[PDB]
């Protein structure tokens, strides 16, 4: 038998699993994002829009200093205001859908903090490079 693990390795197969376990199948969704007269026009528009969305996401990741990485550790400390929940709870009980629902309110704040942290790190790198 193939086994039920291949299901876990399928597209969105870990959507119901704990986010800690779902963190091991990021590449599946990441690759699915680029999978590949009026009807042709509509199909082409959809493809172009998908490409634009992927490029915007990649540009954001690069702007945070996370270019080329699927998991990127940052310098921004976690605020208890966003979520006072424990680490074990988050990474062994909840799923990414539930977590997204919980933290959807603070997402823009976190994005701005990441941008500011990357800018500060870039200028600190440039200033230490003003010193060496």
């Amino acid at each position: 038998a193939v086994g039920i693990g291949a299901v876990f390795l399928g597209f969105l197969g870990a959507a119901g699993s704990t986010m800690g376990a779902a963190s091991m199948t990021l590449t599946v969704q990441a690759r699915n994002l680029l999978s590949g007269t009026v009807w042709g026009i509509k199909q082409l528009q959809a493809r172009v829009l998908a490409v634009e969305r992927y490029l915007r996401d990649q540009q954001l990741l690069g702007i945070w200093g996370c270019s080329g990485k699927l998991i990127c550790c940052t310098n921004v400390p976690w605020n208890s205001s966003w979520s006072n929940r424990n680490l074990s709870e988050i990474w062994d009980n909840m799923t990414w859908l539930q977590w997204d629902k919980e933290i959807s309110n603070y997402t823009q704040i976190i994005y701005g903090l990441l941008e500011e942290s990357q800018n500060q790190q870039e200028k600190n790198e440039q200033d230490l490079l003003a010193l060496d």
């Binding site: 038998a1 193939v2 086994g3 039920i4 299901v7």
Partner: protein, 113 residues
Amino acid sequence: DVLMTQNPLSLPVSLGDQASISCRSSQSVVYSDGNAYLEWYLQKPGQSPKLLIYKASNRFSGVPDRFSASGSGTDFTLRISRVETEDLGLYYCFQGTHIPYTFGGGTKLEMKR
């Protein structure tokens, strides 16, 4: 969903003869990888099920040349030559490609005296 039909319910056979078990799938069992994961399992009275053949063609581990399986897609058949007393038990066919997996109806091998 994958109904595993096994016939006959009882398969009388004399010692040293050949017994054939037919097992038909409702739909195709071939997986995207190209392999068909259909397995035959035997349960002796008072013993847990034992694997016999895997992939419907390959022998589990030095199991007798008597135990030979063949078929394709919808139809799969298991043949047992030179039936011995140790072959008594319930034969079950099992497909392992589509979730949930299912077991065969079951064929009761009966030796003849």
